[PDB]
Amino acid sequence: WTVDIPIDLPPLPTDLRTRLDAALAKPAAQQPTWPADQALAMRTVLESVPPVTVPSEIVRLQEQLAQVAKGEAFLLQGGDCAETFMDNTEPHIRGNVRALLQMAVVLTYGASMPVVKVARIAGQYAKPRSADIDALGLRSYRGDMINGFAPDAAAREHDPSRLVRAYANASAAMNLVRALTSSGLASLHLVHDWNREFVRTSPAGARYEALATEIDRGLRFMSACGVAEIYASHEALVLDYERAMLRLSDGDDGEPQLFDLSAHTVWIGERTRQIDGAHIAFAQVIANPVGVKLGPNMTPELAVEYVERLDPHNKPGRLTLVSRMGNHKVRDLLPPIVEKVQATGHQVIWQCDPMHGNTHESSTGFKTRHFDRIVDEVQGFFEVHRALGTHPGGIHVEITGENVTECLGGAQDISETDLAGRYETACDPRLNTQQSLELAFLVAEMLRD
Amino acid sequence: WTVDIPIDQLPSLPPLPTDLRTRLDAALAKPAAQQPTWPADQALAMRTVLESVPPVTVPSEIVRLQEQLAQVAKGEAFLLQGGDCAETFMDNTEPHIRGNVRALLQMAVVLTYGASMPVVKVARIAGQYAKPRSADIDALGLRSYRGDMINGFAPDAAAREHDPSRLVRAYANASAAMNLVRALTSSGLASLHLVHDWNREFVRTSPAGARYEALATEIDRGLRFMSACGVAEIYASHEALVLDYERAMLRLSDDGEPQLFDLSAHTVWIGERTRQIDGAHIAFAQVIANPVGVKLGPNMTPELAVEYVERLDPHNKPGRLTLVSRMGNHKVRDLLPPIVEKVQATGHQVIWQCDPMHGNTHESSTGFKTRHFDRIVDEVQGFFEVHRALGTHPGGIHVEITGENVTECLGGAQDISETDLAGRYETACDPRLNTQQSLELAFLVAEMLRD
Ligand SMILES: [Mn+2]
Ligand SMILES: [Mn+2]
Numbered sequence: 001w002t003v004d005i006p007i008d009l010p011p012l013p014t015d016l017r018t019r020l021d022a023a024l025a026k027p028a029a030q031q032p033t034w035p036a037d038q039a040l041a042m043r044t045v046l047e048s049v050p051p052v053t054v055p056s057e058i059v060r061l062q063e064q065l066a067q068v069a070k071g072e073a074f075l076l077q078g079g080d081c082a083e084t085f086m087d088n089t090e091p092h093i094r095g096n097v098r099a100l101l102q103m104a105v106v107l108t109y110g111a112s113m114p115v116v117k118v119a120r121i122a123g124q125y126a127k128p129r130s131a132d133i134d135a136l137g138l139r140s141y142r143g144d145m146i147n148g149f150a151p152d153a154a155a156r157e158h159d160p161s162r163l164v165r166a167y168a169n170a171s172a173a174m175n176l177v178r179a180l181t182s183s184g185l186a187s188l189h190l191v192h193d194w195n196r197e198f199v200r201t202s203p204a205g206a207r208y209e210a211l212a213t214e215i216d217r218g219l220r221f222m223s224a225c226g227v228a229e230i231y232a233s234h235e236a237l238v239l240d241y242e243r244a245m246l247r248l249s250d251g252d253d254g255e256p257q258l259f260d261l262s263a264h265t266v267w268i269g270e271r272t273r274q275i276d277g278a279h280i281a282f283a284q285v286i287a288n289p290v291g292v293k294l295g296p297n298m299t300p301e302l303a304v305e306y307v308e309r310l311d312p313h314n315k316p317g318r319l320t321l322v323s324r325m326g327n328h329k330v331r332d333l334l335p336p337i338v339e340k341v342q343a344t345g346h347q348v349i350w351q352c353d354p355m356h357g358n359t360h361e362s363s364t365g366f367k368t369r370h371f372d373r374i375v376d377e378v379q380g381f382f383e384v385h386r387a388l389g390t391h392p393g394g395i396h397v398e399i400t401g402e403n404v405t406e407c408l409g410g411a412q413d414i415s416e417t418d419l420a421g422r423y424e425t426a427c428d429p430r431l432n433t434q435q436s437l438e439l440a441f442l443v444a445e446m447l448r449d
Numbered sequence: 450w451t452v453d454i455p456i457d458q459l460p461s462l463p464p465l466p467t468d469l470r471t472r473l474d475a476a477l478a479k480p481a482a483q484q485p486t487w488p489a490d491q492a493l494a495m496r497t498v499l500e501s502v503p504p505v506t507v508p509s510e511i512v513r514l515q516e517q518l519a520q521v522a523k524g525e526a527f528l529l530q531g532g533d534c535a536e537t538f539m540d541n542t543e544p545h546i547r548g549n550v551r552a553l554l555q556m557a558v559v560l561t562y563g564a565s566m567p568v569v570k571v572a573r574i575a576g577q578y579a580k581p582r583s584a585d586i587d588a589l590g591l592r593s594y595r596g597d598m599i600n601g602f603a604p605d606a607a608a609r610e611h612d613p614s615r616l617v618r619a620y621a622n623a624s625a626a627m628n629l630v631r632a633l634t635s636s637g638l639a640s641l642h643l644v645h646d647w648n649r650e651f652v653r654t655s656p657a658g659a660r661y662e663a664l665a666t667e668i669d670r671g672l673r674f675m676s677a678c679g680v681a682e683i684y685a686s687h688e689a690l691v692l693d694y695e696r697a698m699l700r701l702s703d704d705g706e707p708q709l710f711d712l713s714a715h716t717v718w719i720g721e722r723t724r725q726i727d728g729a730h731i732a733f734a735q736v737i738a739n740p741v742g743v744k745l746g747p748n749m750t751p752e753l754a755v756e757y758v759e760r761l762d763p764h765n766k767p768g769r770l771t772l773v774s775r776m777g778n779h780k781v782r783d784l785l786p787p788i789v790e791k792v793q794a795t796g797h798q799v800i801w802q803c804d805p806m807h808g809n810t811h812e813s814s815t816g817f818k819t820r821h822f823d824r825i826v827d828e829v830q831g832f833f834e835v836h837r838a839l840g841t842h843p844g845g846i847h848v849e850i851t852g853e854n855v856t857e858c859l860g861g862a863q864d865i866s867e868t869d870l871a872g873r874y875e876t877a878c879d880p881r882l883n884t885q886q887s888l889e890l891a892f893l894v895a896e897m898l899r900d
Contacts, residue, residue: 002453003618041452050543050629056636085457090503090700161454168621175628176503183509247543 005164007044012248013256016285020246020258023281028239029272030128032146038160039240045164046244051261052122052167052174053232055249058288061231061264062252064116065289065317068393069347074111074447075320075394076104077233077351078436079120082127082427085144088169090176095401096121097180099433100230101191102198103399103440109215110444116231120398122174123234123263125166126241127427128271141426144169145238149426163241170262174232181228189219198437204411208441236266239278246286257287267291267322270356275305283310291320291396293353296329300340307346316347322396323350326357327377334384342390349393352381359428362408366419368429371409375442382446395443398428399436410435456617462501465701469709473696476736481692481729483581483722485599487611492693495616499697502620504712505575505627506685508702511739514684514715517569518740518768521844522798527564527898528771528845529557530686530802531887532573534879535580538597541622543629548852549574550633550683552884554644555651556850556891562668563895569684573849575627576687576714578619579694580878581722594877597622598691602877616694623713630683639681642672651888657862661892689717689741692729699737708738718742718773721807726756734761742771742800742847746808747780751791758797767798773847774801777808778828785835793841800844803832810879813859817870819880822860826893833897846894849879850887861886 012020032039067073079096080087100117108115125145134140139156141149145166148155184190192215199205199212236242242260251257260266270293272279283290292306303321311319321341325333341348354377355369362368378395385392405421406429408414423429431439464470485492520526532549533540549572557568578598587593592609594602598619601608637643645668652658652665689695689711698713711717721744723730734741743757754772762770772792776784792799805828812818829846836843856872857880859865874880882890 001614002455003614003621004451004453004612005618006451008450045452048542050541050546050625052628054629054632054636057632086459088503089462089501091462093503161452164452164454165457168625171621171625171628172503175505175624175631176507178628178631179504179507179510183507 005045007041009047016248016256016258019285020243023285024239024243024278026276026278026281027274028278029274030237032142032158032160032238032240034158034160039163042160042163043240043244046167046241049167050171051245051247052170053261053264055247055259055261055287057231058259058264059252061116062289062315062317064114065320065349066315067114067317068116069316069349071391073114073116074107075116075118075349075351076100076107077118077120077394078103078397078399080124080400081398081425081430082143083121083124083169084149084426085165085169088173092401093121093173093176094180094185095433096399097177097230098185098191098194099399099401099436101185101228102195102437105188105191106195106215106440106444107447109218110447112449117229118231118233118265119177120233121177122170122232123166125169126235126237128237128269130271145241163238163244166241177230177232181230186228192216192219195437198434202411202434203413204438207411208438211441211444231264233263233265233267235269236260236279236282237269237272239282242266242282251287258285260286260288263288265289265291267293267320269293270295275302275309280306280309289318289320291322291351293322293324293356294337295357296325296333298333298337300336303337303341304344307341307344307348311346311348314346317349319346320349320351320393322353323381324353324355324357325377327354327373327380329357330377330380331384334381335388338384338388338390342388350385350390351394351396352378352392353396354378354381355398355428362416362419364416364419366423366429368419369407371407371435374407374431375439378439378443379446397436397439398430400430401433403434404430404432406430406432407435410438456498456614458498459501461497465699465709466707469701469707473699473709473736476732477692477696477729479727479729479732480725482725483690485595485611485613485691485693487613491613495613496693496697498617499620499694503624504698504700505623506712506715508700508710508712510684511710511715515740515766515768517567518771518800519766520567520768521569522768522800522842524842526567526569527560528569528571528800528802529553529560530571530573530845531556531848531850533577533851534849534881535596535877536574536577537602537877538618538622541626545853546574546626546629547633548884549850550630551638551644551647552850552852552887553683554638555648555888558641558644559648559668559891559895560898562671564898565900569845570682571684571686571716572630573686574630575623575685576619578622579688579690581690581720583722598694616697619694627685630685634681634683645669645672648888651885655862655885656864657889660862661889664892664895684715686714686716686718688720689730689733690720690723692733695733702738709736711737711739714739716740716742718744718771720744721746726753726760731760740769740771742773742802744773744775744804744807745788747776747784749784749788751788754788755791755795758792758795758799762797762799765797768800770797771800771802771844773804774832775804775806775808776828778805778824778831780808781828781831782835785832786839789835789839789841793839801836801842802845802847803829803843804847805829805832806849806879813867813870815867815870817874817880819870820858822858822886822889825858825882826890829890829894830897848887848890849881851881852884854885855881855883857881857883858886861889
């Protein structure tokens with residue numbers, strides 16, 4: 001029923017303490033409303049636990065994201081919209097790890113350059129809400145780090161013990177993804193046989209067979225000539241969790257720096273990116289690579305201010321700007337943002353989020369996304385970058401290794417009536433096994449010279 | 450004082466196949482020694498939670514270990530197994546885990562050079578949270594401490610009661626530790642040169658440094674040679690003691706035939722007090738695919754040793770069974786030879802491993818249970834003298850160590866005394882070799898290994 005843990009370390013450098021305290025004294029949107037004394041007790045437990053990631057892996061990610069920023073690699077970021085403790089199981093994790101590897105080999109062939117793989121995993125347990133009371137009149141579900149999905153009042157109370165449950169689930173998952181990435185799942189030939197089974201059994205396989213066959217000949221060629229790292233990420237939302245997981249280490253200049261060891265990279269969402277808020281200030285104090293989500297109310301001028309605050313030393317790949325405009329708005333809204341930022345001399349990664357600007361409620365009462373709109377935003381994103389001569393750096397996608405019925409369309413041609421089949425997401429609709437693979441194939445075509 | 454963390458009750462996955470479960474049932478119907486006395490319905494509730502969690506290890510890693518252990522049994526590799534006697538939840542921290550991983554990597558590079566063949570590294574880590582006790586009642590009049598998977602070290606009645614929620618807390622700690630071990634072995638510690646730079650800092654600052662300096666300099670010259678010519682795996686292990694934990698962690702994988710693996714570790718061993726030939730622990734080791742070890746003490750007969758080979762290695766797979774000698778330094782040269790002769794004649798290929806710690810324990814006048822470095826060294830040496838004389842392979846060592854400057858074992862370069870023991874005796878059970886004493890042993894066994 002309950003685990004019991006008793007409460008009964010070296011100080012930070014004086015300047016890092018001052019800066020951390022100042023970041024956390026700024027106002028913060030979307031925080032849990034639990035008591036400060038209970039939060040503090042939970043953070044004290046987390047301050048001594050083994051970290052989810054280590055500094056050397058974060059420094060290595062930074063070097064790989066620098067190549068992406070310079071136009072010599074591509075970033076694939078993907079996973080569940082919301083991880084749940086309930087589905088934090090071996091089959092679910094393996095299914096997502098495999099999906100990401102499958103998409104990555106397809107994208108690598110299309111881009112003709114390395115693909116950096118960042119999973120939404122081992123921490124994606126918190127979400128923001130526009131309304132604190134939902135459609136059933138209950139306090140809103142804010143992810144398993146905060147409260148329960150169950151539609152009852154007791155379940156929806158904010159519960160600080162979920163910080164520690166979140167850590168435990170994150171460690172366990174990350175342990176498995178490390179294991180899985182040094183196993184036979186690694187092998188590029190095994191990973192691509194899955195894609196060819198997908199081509200054989202998919203209703204739209206004829207659309208993708210030529211490209212699947214060409215990839216298979218590239219792999220066999222490589223072998224005829226004599227011839228896996230998955231990073232963890234989540235939205236840095238709950239500051240009690242992120243601050244508890246900070247650790248001091250010597251950074252890429254040999255001086256002690258603060259690393260958030262809850263993940264390798266984190267991003268700041270649309271509702272928490274206040275320029276003078278705690279999330280942006282917290283991002284300025286940590287050594288991790290960071291991303292900021294940019295929606296349709298973004299100005300070129302605010303985008304530059306984010307770049308100058310978050311990438312003050314002009315470190316290629318330290319900052320990612322994640323575009324989510326809507327498929328009908330991206331072609332008009334993005335170019336002015338890109339031009340103004342390019343002119344600063346900084347090298348950010350431009351990443352497309354084709355999911356969050358394109359959501360709508362179906363007549364059957366399910367929030368859903370159409371495949372054609374998702375594809376069209378990624379396409380428009382590539383067009384904006386071709387015209388300006390800039391690098392389309394990656395995609396940020398929400399997916400699952402399960403055959404869910406959540407997003408409309410694809411090869412399966414999922415309808416409004418089919419959405420009830422198994423709509424399993426705890427939050428936003430995921431592209432299923434098939435639809436995620438389809439998009440990787442379509443984006444690989446977009447990447448071709 | 451303490452916080453209560455809810456154990457989420459989550460949906461079950463498919464059950465294990467019916468045929469394999471029937472066989473597991475027959476096996477666990479045998480009597481099991483040294484088990485927790487918590488209620489069966491509470492135990493069942495916690496097993497059900499553990500049956501659906503992500504595993505600590507995966508099958509492909511275990512079949513890789515079996516391949517490397519096969520090389521050890523054939524005389525082509527050497528086994529290094531070491532870590533804390535008792536892992537605690539309180540010391541399951543980054544610095545402590547990093548100190549133990551580093552110590553293992555430091556010992557392994559020195560042993561690799563001396564043996565002239567690969568060294569397989571198995572940590573006592575990520576699950577060594579349970580132990581037997583001979584005593585009903587300890588010296589304070591309390592129920593005995595049984596390790597963190599069972600009860601608390603603190604000397605009070607409430608802490609000492611058997612708490613099945615500690616099964617789940619043990620899993621969380623094991624998972625978190627393993628995650629860090631995986632990260633550390635693909636990090637800067639992977640560098641052979643970095644690891645041996647710590648060995649040469651050891652030679653520079655040790656009082657006995659002159660004893661190891663020639664050999665340290667030689668290893669450094671070998672690494673630089675390798676570099677001049679143009680030119681990362683640590684496994685988890687523990688004593689399989691608490692069957693509620695080990696059975697909840699069984700998972701299906703494929704010989705080609707469906708099989709159970711214990712995915713709480715890569716390899717497990719059966720101790721001196723639970724190795725009853727007709728008991729549940731040996732029966733459990735029969736059913737699982739993992740490589741296994743059995744501890745063998747002074748009361749072992751060559752005949753009972755042969756009964757272990759026939760129970761635990763029916764298919765004659767080299768390296769599947771490791772027999773772990775712990776005789777006492779004064780008894781090893783007399784007692785071990787006939788056991789080895791009898792086993793070799795069966796035609797099976799076991800790994801012969803030395804445990805020089807557990808046969809050599811004694812209590813000081815100052816009241817601390819401790820071990821003398823000279824007795825520990827003398828048993829590994831006697832172990833090497835036995836195998837040389839029979840023409841068999843001294844397959845590895847099983848040692849209890851830590852990466853901190855503790856005062857638990859007497860002797861070494863620092864010449865730790867009975868008075869020094871009270872400085873920092875930090876073990877939750879047996880006296881461990883500290884950072885320095887561990888390294889010294891590795892250097893001396895490197896000399897033993899030299900051709
Ligand atoms: Mn989402
Ligand atoms: Mn011991």
